[PDB]
Amino acid sequence: DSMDHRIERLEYYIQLLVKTVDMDRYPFYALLIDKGLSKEEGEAVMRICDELSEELATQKAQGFVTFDKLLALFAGQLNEKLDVHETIFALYEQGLYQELMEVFIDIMKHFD
Amino acid sequence: DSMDHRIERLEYYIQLLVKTVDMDRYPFYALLIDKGLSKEEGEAVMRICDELSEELATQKAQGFVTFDKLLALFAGQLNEKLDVHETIFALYEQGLYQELMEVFIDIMKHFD
């Protein structure tokens, strides 16, 4: 009964605390919480980044120098609660998947 | 059943995390959590600030230059769990309701 009220308060406090996160350091984690992704969803985003980063390294080893298709695949599978640009810049700023993010930022720069 | 224990743990963790908040940037959010205010209570505080800020803007437009009574109204309706001085300084430091807070801080300097 009141266990629900305890949980609501905790939910309110997380909403307050995420507002105190240094956005220059952990914007991606702030994004996950702010957009309400579950653990499964958050992990699914990372797996997409893992696989596309691994595909990028593989293609580079094979002599590929353009990887525009990787961004389209990313955009096509990324959780719809998230914005592509916003997620990429957040991952980038938090220091995650650097190689892949720099490639995505480069591609967006060419087409935006 | 055992859902109580997992919640108790989360409550402990929020208590630890609020202690890690940069008090020069988010003292007001820290105060809400530290004093145990519910979401409804936190929002009620913001609503008082909204209305007194709007009353202040309205009185300034009408030519008033003193607004001492706004602090008495604030102090009389502010949630009992909070200290007037502490709340005002917290709101001020976090950058919220600047106009109203500066007026409140001025009034307090004249009467404290």
Place this chain on the structure above:
Amino acid sequence: MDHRIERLEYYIQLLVKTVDMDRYPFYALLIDKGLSKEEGEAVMRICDELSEELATQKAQGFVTFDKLLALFAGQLNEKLDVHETIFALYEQGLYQELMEVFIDIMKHFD
């Protein structure tokens, strides 16, 4: 109700990763290792008592306190590493006197 709690547990896991480790490594440690409130409090109580024992022995003229670290390692929650906990407590500014004595002892024996 279970799913809401699970999400909060995930968010706490995310938030603890945003903690400034130069300022609150000990609190980050408690959360990261999953200690309950009672466990967290029990750690502080061990530090309280050994800090008090240290102040007491200093007053009596003792100048070596190696045994205090052994007592600490012997009672400290098994979920925590001794070195890691001491450095986290030290860096967060807690039990300064006791931690400096522990760090000194470790330097002599590590």
